[PDB]
Ligand SMILES: CC1CCN(C(=O)c2cc3ccccc3o2)CC1
Ligand SMILES: [Cl-]
Ligand SMILES: [Zn+2]
């Protein structure tokens with residue numbers, strides 16, 4: 001307890017000795033409260049004016065406009081699983097880390113890799129120096145990391161504290177993030193959750209492949225496809241989950257092993273967190289369970305634990321084991337022989353991205369196999385605890401990573417599987433920018449990032465192909481796309497480029513696409529088809545409305561408004577790539 005968190009707690013008390021007070025009005029039951037000190041401090045969503053001026057019909061659609069305006073889950077506790085549950089989880093975790101390790105070598109990530117990440121600008125969740133980029137050069141920072149690092153090898157921790165701010169993001173100081181990245185970065189940096197290595201994973205696949213992947217799961221013999229979301233996944237990670245995740249250190253050696261064992265032991269299985277309570281004060285609270293790590297390591301361990309949970313739900317539906325209460329010795333033998341005999345085949349029946357999953361089990365007994373899943377604390381969202389899962393019968397209706405997928409037949413008979421979501425969501429997200437101080441140039445370059453993503457991923461939506469052409473016509477041709485349209489770890493961001501978008505489309509959808517046999521290049525945007533007119537309207541298209549027809553017909557006036565604001569620059573007209581503007 002305080003033997004592991006004490007140093008951190010006592011160090012904080014000393015930097016706020018003037019203010020320290022053991023309050024009696026602390027709203028913590030499940031979190032252990034330690035003390036409080038004086039604070040005075042808090043970034044809301046800003047609108048992107050380039051995208052808004054070029055999407056005027058949506059200015060009167062509340063689903064779009066409300067996206068730009070702007071607890072009882074973090075302060076709960078999960079029961080400890082039954083003994084049979086613990087046994088299933090240890091055996092499956094042991095086996096899963098062995099499978100993920102067969103063709104990969106755990107290894108430390110480097111200052112250099114971390115330096116390039118911050119220099120290339122990435123979302124690490126950080127807080128003497130003001131910018132992360134500057135701290136990477138001030139050797140004093142690296143001496144602070146060295147100081148901490150040697151404490152970790154001594155099995156102690158001084159500065160690895162969380163700043164808390166169905167979401168809450170646990171920021172840490174850049175040095176705390178370096179040491180996490182050094183010890184566990186390999187999981188993401190070397191693609192341990194790729195489909196090739198994990199069979200169930202989709203890390204680095206890209207949104208152009210997820211649909212083809214769901215269609216390949218559909219080709220397997222079995223029952224419905226199940227996509228049960230969990231109710232607040234990060235808050236349901238048990239210390240037993242944290243202990244099965246830690247068994248990755250069993251595959252490590254030397255310094256690496258000691259560094260990873262201390263991240264698990266001292267930051268994950270024992271946390272210290274500063275919450276900013278308006279009543280304002282800074283509470284120093286602690287706890288052993290729940291997820292609280294870097295977003296990228298959180299993705300990897302979520303995928304791992306979810307892969308484990310879903311194989312165990314599959315075992316339960318196949319009657320590999322009778323009850324979670326206690327596992328017989330012969331049932332343990334059976335679970336292992338099951339894993340050895342068909343583990344890899346059953347991983348390939350899944351697509352898993354963090355807390356999100358699609359399972360095509362052997363048959364529909366999976367639907368009522370709920371005891372292990374509820375007893376692991378992975379309670380399904382929006383359905384009665386003991387009510388059977390509603391499956392899907394068509395892979396084109398299954399939700400995954402906030403998308404559904406359409407089969408789209410090109411004029412030449414070749415078959416695209418394309419991602420899609422309600423168009424109000426796509427336009428509402430492109431109208432939002434994060435953070436302060438953006439120039440008009442930076443704003444335009446973020447608008448251009450969204451526009452190129454739409455041209456590559458959502459070309460089949462009439463309204464997004466037109467708006468993407470308008471935005472690319474309205475931003476200087478040579479200005480480079482900036483920021484991130486998305487942070488999804490499945491994403492590959494082929495739209496972040498100044499290459500010609502028809503050249504990228506051909507590479508992504510034809511040349512590099514293993515589901516396309518005939519590699520005949522497409523020569524024009526007119527060869528590239530749309531969803532049916534009715535399919536387009538069902539997924540939120542404004543085609544057949546008057547506001548939309550005025551917008552499309554007068555698009556060159558909206559393009560000219562934005563060109564006049566940006567000023568006298570080199571622009572290209574992309575509207576003639578569409579038939580209706582081709583004179
Ligand atoms: C649900 C149906 C969609 C097609 N309809 C149109 O009126 C239409 C098609 C179209 C294509 C491009 C620009 C405007 C457009 O309007 C009828 C209703
Ligand atoms: Cl269905
Ligand atoms: Zn530490």
Ligand SMILES: [Zn+2]
Nearest residue numbers: 404420421539
């Ligand atoms: Zn759709």
